[PDB]
């Protein structure tokens, strides 16, 4: 070695680690400070954000407000609980994002007791919709989107979830520039191809497009669609009745499991006595190896 060791003792002595979630690459604190901090003259008024996180096999929608001891989550919806009713395959897509945002909105409204009021846009169309607070009635729930580190280009599933929530009846400030119907050239929102995306017609078009060219490629792509016979003609009706089921019953019931034996799958941390004994044994073995020579 002829170059100065950059990561010498002094480097670690002066090294300042970042925040744990910054090192994990999960939290953008620059956006978080602007997103979760309430005005000081609003005092203990909660500031609600709708966290949307699209995972490789799931979509997580949560509503949270920040506190000193940690974020307080008041309502959570997942795409893995969609198979409870209607849609069961082809999750983590735009239609499932809409469905889970709608489920989050309906569940939160049901918990707060605002269902007859703020029914939202029951008849789904891609056009813009913003719920208005009704006088003489409790105000509409207002929250702000938290997209995290997702790149917010046009057609993002976080905006699909936002559309689902605002159709469910949540007052989320937004614009149509990021919905899939928006045309970046004419600066005009179609609101029809957006509804096609909401109903999953792009996936249906892909299915019937693969059928007419390469049947085995269609099998490989939509292998699990073949199971239980989900077909492009019935995809839109499936999503519509999934929305209807969401509106009919948004209440989440937990699943009980307590008859689990306490088994430990991780090695416990060794003790100081054990480590000292291990060092002593290694020294003794090395001296023994030398004296054998």
């Amino acid at each position: 070695g002829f170059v100065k060791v950059v990561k010498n003792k002094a480097y670690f002595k002066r090294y300042q680690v970042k925040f744990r979630r910054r090192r994990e690459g999960k939290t953008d604190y620059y956006a978080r400070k602007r997103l979760v901090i309430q005005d000081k003259n609003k005092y203990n008024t909660p500031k609600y954000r709708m966290i949307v996180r699209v995972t490789n096999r799931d979509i997580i929608c949560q509503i949270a407000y920040a506190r000193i001891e940690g974020d307080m989550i008041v309502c959570a919806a997942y795409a893995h609980e969609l198979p409870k009713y209607g849609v069961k395959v082809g999750l983590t897509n735009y239609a499932a994002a809409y469905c889970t945002g709608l489920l989050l909105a309906r569940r939160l409204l049901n918990r707060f007791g605002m269902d007859k009021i703020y029914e939202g846009q029951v008849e789904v169309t891609g056009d813009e919709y913003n719920v208005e607070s009704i006088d003489g009635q409790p105000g509409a729930f207002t929250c702000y989107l938290d997209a995290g580190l997702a790149r917010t280009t046009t057609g993002n599933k976080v905006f699909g979830a936002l559309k689902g929530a605002v159709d469910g009846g949540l007052s989320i400030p937004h614009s149509t520039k990021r919905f899939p119907g928006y045309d970046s050239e004419s600066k005009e929102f179609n609101a029809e191809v957006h509804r096609k995306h909401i109903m999953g017609q792009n996936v249906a078009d892909y299915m019937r497009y693969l059928m007419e060219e390469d049947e085995d490629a269609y099998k490989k792509q939509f292998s699990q669609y073949i199971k239980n016979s989900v077909t492009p003609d019935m995809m839109e009706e499936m999503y519509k009745k999934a929305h209807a089921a969401i509106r009919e019953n948004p209440v989440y019931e937990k699943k009980p499991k307590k008859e689990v034996k306490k088994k430990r799958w991780n090695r416990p941390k060794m003790s100081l006595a054990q480590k000292k004994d291990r060092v002593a044994q290694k020294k003794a073995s090395f001296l023994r190896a030398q004296e054998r020579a």
């Binding site: 290694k282 020294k283 090395f286 030398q290």
Partner: peptide
């Protein structure tokens, strides 16, 4: 490290 110990005594 014990490697520095066993380069000594050798």
């Amino acid at each position: 490290p014990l490697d520095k110990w066993r380069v000594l005594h050798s």
